[PDB]
Amino acid sequence: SKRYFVTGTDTEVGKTVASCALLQAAKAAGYRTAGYKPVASGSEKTPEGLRNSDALALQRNSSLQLDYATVNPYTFAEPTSPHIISAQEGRPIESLVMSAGLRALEQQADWVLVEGAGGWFTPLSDTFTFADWVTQEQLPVILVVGVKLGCINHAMLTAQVIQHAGLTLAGWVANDVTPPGKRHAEYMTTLTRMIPAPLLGEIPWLAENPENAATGKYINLALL
Amino acid sequence: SKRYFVTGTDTEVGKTVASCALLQAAKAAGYRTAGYKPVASGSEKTPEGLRNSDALALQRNSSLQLDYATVNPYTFAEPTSPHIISAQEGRPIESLVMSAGLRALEQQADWVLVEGAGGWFTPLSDTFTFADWVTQEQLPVILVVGVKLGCINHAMLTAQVIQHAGLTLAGWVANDVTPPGKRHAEYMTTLTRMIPAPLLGEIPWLAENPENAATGKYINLALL
Ligand SMILES: Nc1ncnc2c1ncn2[C@@H]1O[C@H](COP(=O)(O)OP(=O)(O)O)[C@@H](O)[C@H]1O
Ligand SMILES: Nc1ncnc2c1ncn2[C@@H]1O[C@H](COP(=O)(O)OP(=O)(O)O)[C@@H](O)[C@H]1O
Ligand SMILES: C[C@H](N)[C@@H](CCCCCC(=O)O)NC(=O)O
Ligand SMILES: C[C@H](N)[C@@H](CCCCCC(=O)O)NC(=O)O
Numbered sequence: 001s002k003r004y005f006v007t008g009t010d011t012e013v014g015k016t017v018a019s020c021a022l023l024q025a026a027k028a029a030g031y032r033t034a035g036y037k038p039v040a041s042g043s044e045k046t047p048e049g050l051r052n053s054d055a056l057a058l059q060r061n062s063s064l065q066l067d068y069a070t071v072n073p074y075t076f077a078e079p080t081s082p083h084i085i086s087a088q089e090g091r092p093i094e095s096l097v098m099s100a101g102l103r104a105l106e107q108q109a110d111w112v113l114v115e116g117a118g119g120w121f122t123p124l125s126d127t128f129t130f131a132d133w134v135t136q137e138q139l140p141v142i143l144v145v146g147v148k149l150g151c152i153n154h155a156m157l158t159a160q161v162i163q164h165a166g167l168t169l170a171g172w173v174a175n176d177v178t179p180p181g182k183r184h185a186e187y188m189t190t191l192t193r194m195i196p197a198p199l200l201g202e203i204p205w206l207a208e209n210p211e212n213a214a215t216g217k218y219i220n221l222a223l224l
Numbered sequence: 225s226k227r228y229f230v231t232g233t234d235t236e237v238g239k240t241v242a243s244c245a246l247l248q249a250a251k252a253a254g255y256r257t258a259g260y261k262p263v264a265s266g267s268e269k270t271p272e273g274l275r276n277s278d279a280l281a282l283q284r285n286s287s288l289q290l291d292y293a294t295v296n297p298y299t300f301a302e303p304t305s306p307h308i309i310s311a312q313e314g315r316p317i318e319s320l321v322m323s324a325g326l327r328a329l330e331q332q333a334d335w336v337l338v339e340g341a342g343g344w345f346t347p348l349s350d351t352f353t354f355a356d357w358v359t360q361e362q363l364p365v366i367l368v369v370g371v372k373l374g375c376i377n378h379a380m381l382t383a384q385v386i387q388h389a390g391l392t393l394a395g396w397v398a399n400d401v402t403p404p405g406k407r408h409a410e411y412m413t414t415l416t417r418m419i420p421a422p423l424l425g426e427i428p429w430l431a432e433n434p435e436n437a438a439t440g441k442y443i444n445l446a447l448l
């Protein structure tokens with residue numbers, strides 16, 4: 001299977017919206033797709049247990065019919081850092097379980113997108129961060145950049161750190177979290193010059209419900 | 225002179241509020257102080273030229289009576305990245321001018337705090353970032369962390385990058401940009417464990433005008 005990890009310059013920059021666009025483009029290319037969010041925090045109660053909205057977005061944008069727990073094995077109700085609520089609840093986030101879940105999806109899918117939680121260094125325990133697991137698995141990384149004042153600094157910090165870990169930065173996606181602003185073109189040119197990987201596409205500001213929108217057309221999958 | 229550079233996990237995290245607290249503590253320790261913001265964007269028109277509010281905060285919190293241009297040689301009206309507006313206006317930001325200004329302050333002050341613009345990697349031209357100048361000058365670095373969801377990742381990214389440049393991270397300051405939230409203690413414990421430098425103090429949420437507030441008491445200067 002082709003496998004990619006998606007990270008962001010921060011929490012709430014559109015990692016989930018961009019992952020749905022990537023999944024839609026891959027399905028259009030003919031792949032059997034699966035989205036995987038191994039850890040999620042910020043979830044609602046239902047008859048079946050807790051359900052996270054970002055994991056549900058990945059489940060319904062995958063081409064295969066997948067069970068919720070296969071897409072998201074670790075679901076926490078409170079929207080905070082996973083290591084805090086894991087410790088509070090007495091439910092360890094185990095590296096072996098996260099890796100087993102990825103293998104289980106590779107039995108049915110040939111294109112798997114793994115979405116992180118928060119940015120690059122989100123702690124999963126007191127001695128283990130999400131970056132440690134990505135390094136262990138040697139996953140190529142796609143960076144989602146929310147375009148806003150302050151994003152050049154956060155895009156360059158994340159790019160340098162991935163490269164120093166010896167991982168491949170496969171590309172980046174620009175996501176327009178706000179309406180058209182005055183220096184949008186100049187920000188796009190600087191980010192293109194400075195991030196050492198191809199720009200895969202730009203998702204526009206979409207007021208109504210951008211997880212459900214047909215956004216695959218904004219990604220050029222040939223660059224991955 | 226003692227010289228320190230202050231950076232932040234992002235723009236608008238309280239770098240200026242924390243710099244005024246540091247300057248107030250240094251004056252209380254008996255130093256002849258000077259604040260220096262060599263580049264500033266986001267400024268008002270006056271009879272005397274453009275004036276930036278953060279540079280004015282540093283000027284009035286310094287113990288010496290200083291002229292505005294000595295505190296801030298490069299003033300731009302628009303609140304954007306300095307390299308965009310520098311190019312637009314035809315006014316180059318020169319490394320030699322920024323360094324000369326620092327030397328000029330060292331003639332009168334024995335404790336100088338240099339405040340950056342934005343975060344670590346803010347571009348000053350198409351081939352030069354603020355980090356390049358800090359490295360050239362070999363300044364020790366103080367990191368200001370705005371405590372909010374997403375700050376663990378941004379604090380760890382900035383810490384790693386400074387250390388890989390061979391610079392010293394002298395310490396960090398926690399700044400409470402919002403009211404007391406549910407996981408404040410746990411965030412403080414994680415940040416203390418993960419940032420490899422001493423916590424110099426914590427500035428509380430101060431609704432009214434925290435640049436003018438007496439905040440020196442929140443910094444323990446003995447750790448610097
Ligand atoms: N392109 C966009 N247009 C409009 N709103 C967006 C866009 N991208 C993200 N948003 C909104 O920003 C919020 C965070 O997006 P999300 O993908 O969940 O972020 P993340 O996975 O990085 O935490 C959501 O409410 C989402 O609808
Ligand atoms: N501790 C605080 N309490 C209340 N407001 C704060 C605090 N720190 C920062 N702010 C507010 O946040 C905004 C940004 O602060 P500022 O120091 O100018 O940031 P920066 O130098 O990082 O760009 C200002 O409006 C400021 O009043
Ligand atoms: C306007 C802001 N306050 C700040 C500049 C932020 C530049 C952000 C660059 C980036 O996108 O990383 N300017 C300043 O500190 O004077
Ligand atoms: C609640 C957020 N959306 C996110 C967790 C953010 C953790 C932030 C850690 C940090 O401070 O860097 N969870 C998630 O992606 O499922």
Ligand SMILES: [Ca+2]
Binds near residue numbers: 016053054
């Ligand atoms: Ca979300």
Ligand SMILES: [Ca+2]
Binds near residue numbers: 240
């Ligand atoms: Ca300010």
